[PDB]
Symmetry: D2
Subunit: 360 residues, 4 copies
């Protein structure tokens, strides 16, 4: 089979690999819709999680089952599935301790395009498939559902980590697709006033459609002073960090009230240290809790989030700015995320099969 | 002054009372907008919380300050305020351990029309005024803000007690005004599918506008069976009880998954015992958590919820089905709550003063 | 092989069964140390969870691995293990949402002697062995470690469900071996004063050694009145239920403060309904939270609790009042749990093998 | 009256001040037992929380009521009280939001020797006295209880912030008196293995008496490598930071597992930034939660912690290494904390009065 792979830090290329073996609990899956992620750009070109050889890239897919292991009981060949970016080993220590996304070690539930061949190939492998794949609801388009795999779950996790409460004033820093889903998540956790902070302008407007009330432009003054002015010096109740760099945490601490939460979901691609300012952190004692976490995954997470689409309560289509057909175009799509043109949010790649609707 | 009072179990009438005394931390307030509550109905006619004589009724008000104590620092004469139904003693033991609504004993933060003269009088008393009174935002109509005092905060509290998570399937039992607010609260905590259980048709359309997806009418049969059918036997994730009686808890237990929460905010007006069925409660071990709580109050709770009106994220006007003018009309309004026409959600009474815009 | 089985309601006896089949993730285990439980007593003689025929009893074992499946990676033949009473299916829905003890449905992680052949046989089966079996630390006697399987973990779980905070005054109702472990768990969650409710005198001294401060015997009168007197009417902060019957919950409600938690871990053997008194439950609004939960299990739970024995912080040996040798003596041991001499806390049965120290 | 005051950053001296006025909710209190704190050394000589003029120092006291305001209902003249270092304004926004220690702003519940005249004077003032003073139990020595005001509550808060669970392996970094109470707190929250990390050796031994199992000497190698070696590379479950500097956080992150908590209570006296290492923080995603908080205070906190002394479950006497008599000796005692001799943990100063036992 063909797949698009990382060939050591700094290089991608198409390669041929055998089809993965399918153990008793596993499933093999062919992609129907795929998206590329900014995370793969940090991983390939910044070496942000270390070196990899012949690793198929990608971790956002809707797919169709082409094989199941002997002990798979909930899935059959031909089933269409939402594939979560995180596919935990559910019996590992960290899963039993409430952190399945770190199953087998830090970030270990994130397999696809972390250390496991991902979804940018003709067939890919899923561990604990009964546990890790949700059936695609008949009322959701494959491209809408591909946004669940990572963008919705990660953005929403930012808002979960920020411990957002009913009527909270929230600031979301970074308004790419994960940030837009952090705004939506905060809205769905009951935030009132929501400040969206972008480098851009263009897609801070879409943030208003997901529940943002106030847009803050970096290219204007210091965002902290802008935020303190808008709040009459009081600051915000909670902060989600969904973009930026290692220096964004200091801004969050400076704009937030004492007794609060900062929820980071940004994959930090470079920099030795994240600096937290001693004074504005209440000299160690301000209860400004700092969290940084990898998204949940598995079937239940996808099922719960999918219900928001099915019930008309979340529109993920707004994130899709560019559409391609054919497995080859995942290369083109990943290069867009590397080069970041103006009107880009997320590309999606659809793949057609002649037995798409008849495979069994 | 005049006020409408409970004159022992089964009787109300107007009485004259002295204007209450104002201590250093207290405020005296006059009503600008008032609403009656079915709670006063249980208290008066069912004797649900014991006998009372000459206790002024009502605990839902937007008001205007007429006097402040010498130690009140945030408020002044003429300020217009949202009065929470619950006005805790914030330094009491129960407050220090995170339950201010029980300040000084069980239900002790619910003063107005529980054991303290309520808001249905020309002047009423607020303890710890700086802590307990939120300023009325200029962008909210008094009639909409009076829904914050109890309806919004109580219905939202049901959703909070039910521990609603993103994408959960929720059942709200009872769709009076509290119930509609439990649907809204559930929606604002991120619920997907939401079953609303009631019989009235307009309640069962406003509920859809607040985020209900599914309407369950008992006339179509046993509501548990209905819910189990609709969820292909798995049941719902979380339940909010916002109406019904002591037997509603068994229904909740029977329709909910193991590892779940039942959030009750219904004031139970009669019956010796709430029956929990042993087998369906997992013979003691089902992790079907049962919560029954009085609403939060105080200014912060009002400020936070008011922000949802100010930001366009909550429309409390849908709750108002009857409008009156003049203080004396709180009697007619309360009688609506007792006689219960199918026209009814919430009445509001508007009261004007010659110096409503000039008092200072 | 032979095993001691429930032969329908009201009868036990020895039977021959095939050695169970071992799948890729499973392990077969032989008992080194066994204990009987009053739970099997309710199951057999009261029919508390329905009828069963030819189901092998017991769910408390230290064991030795005799076979592993092809996909078992952490265990090998001859390894000695602590077997949790609860052995979840970790990838099931309920596990993914944080309730692995209900994997596959309510009580579904409690397999042994609920619906799956238990540990009272020459060989028994463990699903998801790598996840579910902890290695026996070399510094713990098998007889002490067998208390971890259910007694420690269940009693500690009562304390966890009761939401015990530093310095809380706690009442533990029922001071059998689970109850003594609820006292210990409460002590290990930082409780100060701890009332232990029972009638037996030695239970009411071991309880003092585990952190009880106050012993309450019903023979001195109504236990609620006793507790209210002892707390000058304010009542207790938190209650753990570890014994009694369906009527114990009302006692708990009556003796506890508003804004509190009642943590039940008692397996209720009979009765249609658990009665919660309306007035004392704050007419629905007292924030007296009611929790009823099956113990956690799996290896991590066993590892964590075992660490408390290894570090000198928990002495489970005090629980053991009767010691037997040989597998057949699990019958005598279970009959002790049924006939209930005042001598009794927990029996343990030790089973030896010629190759106990050489099997590999 | 005389008091020991901060006279601008860098200077202390004895000054004369009038006795404070006593408002309706206030109490005036004379000291019976006092302790100095390392925090006052950062505040005076490092200027760590800004400049102050004529501010009486100290915030650890047991005292006796000499005057009460007209609305004080729970205290009378002559009552002996445990005075918490934190005396919140319980109705302020932050208190209503669950953070009373930040009442009126970050650190605002910490009044004594933060910005309010403290306890090192013949008479001092307490706001909201009914809420903020606990009666001294008859079974606790004044000097034992002085350790509750700050040392026990802060150390225990470190363990609370570290989210310690039953059987957790914990590392406590910094083993001064706050650290020794963090070890005790972790023990009282159910930790198993506990590593105590000191610069010293002498009072790492006392740490074993409070539940530490392993001592780690800074003067030996890198504490992170020591800890990873002792845990077979697995690291610890939770970390409490109770001493050190801005660089201690990086050590905590490097020794802790993914999916975990670091609870800081160290008042950080200098340094612009606290550095968190990007890589070992899981490049933003390791769920290594970082918390830093000021202790709770008020009466209930003191009452709960005092119960641990009364019940024989906490011995605070072990912290007292030096004893003085007379109000003047608080100067001597504070200089010990500045200069830090070898065998010092905490000094205590007792003050005798001829009507100590007769004042009314
Ligand atoms: C699976 As990810 C770290 O790109 O959100
Ligand atoms: C203050 As109420 C019990 O009527 O919601
Ligand atoms: C596994 As059990 C209900 O006997 O503690
Ligand atoms: C009151 As303190 C910051 O010295 O623990
Ligand atoms: Mg707000
Ligand atoms: Mg005028
Ligand atoms: Mg451990
Ligand atoms: Mg051999
Ligand atoms: Zn390489
Ligand atoms: Zn991604
Ligand atoms: Zn009467
Ligand atoms: Zn009401
Ligand atoms: Zn039968
Ligand atoms: Zn058992
Ligand atoms: Zn100065
Ligand atoms: Zn201090």
């Amino acid at each position: 089979m063909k797949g698009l792979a990382m060939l050591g830090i700094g290089r991608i290329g198409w390669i041929e690999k055998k089809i993965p073996e399918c153990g008793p609990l596993d499933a093999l899956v062919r992609p129907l819709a795929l998206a590329p992620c900014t995370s793969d750009t940090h991983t390939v070109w910044a070496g942000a999680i270390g070196d990899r050889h012949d690793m198929i890239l990608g971790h956002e897919a809707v797919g169709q089952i082409v094989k199941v292991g002997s002990l798979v009981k909930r899935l059959k060949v031909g089933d269409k599935v939402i594939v979560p970016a995180i596919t935990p080993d559910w019996g590992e220590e960290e899963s039993q301790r409430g952190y399945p996304m770190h199953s087998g070690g830090m970030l270990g539930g994130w397999k696809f395009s972390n250390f496991k061949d991902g979804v940018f190939s003709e067939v890919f492998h899923v561990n604990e498939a009964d546990a890790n794949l949700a059936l695609l609801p008949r009322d959701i388009k494959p491209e809408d559902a591909v946004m669940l795999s990572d963008m919705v779950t990660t953005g929403f996790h930012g808002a979960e980590l920020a411990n957002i409460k009913l009527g909270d004033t929230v600031c979301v820093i970074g308004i790419g697709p994960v940030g837009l889903m952090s705004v939506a998540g905060a809205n769905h956790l009951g935030a009132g006033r929501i400040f969206a902070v972008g480098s851009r302008k263009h897609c801070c407007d879409i943030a208003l459609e997901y529940g943002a009330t106030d847009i803050i432009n970096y290219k204007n003054g210091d965002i902290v002073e802008q935020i303190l002015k808008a709040t009459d010096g009081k600051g915000v109740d909670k902060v989600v960090i969904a973009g930026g760099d290692v220096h964004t945490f200091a801004q969050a601490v400076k704009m937030i009230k004492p007794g609060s939460d900062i929820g980071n979901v940004n994959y930090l691609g470079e920099g030795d240290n994240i600096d937290i300012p001693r004074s504005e952190w209440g000299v160690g004692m301000g209860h400004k809790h700092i969290h940084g976490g990898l998204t949940p995954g598995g079937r239940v997470r996808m099922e719960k989030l999918a219900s928001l689409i099915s019930t008309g309560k979340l529109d993920t289509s707004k994130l899709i700015t560019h559409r391609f057909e054919g497995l080859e175009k995942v290369e083109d799509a990943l290069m867009l995320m590397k080069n970041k043109p103006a009107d880009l949010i997320k590309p999606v790649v659809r793949i057609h099969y002649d037995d798409e609707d008849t495979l069994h």
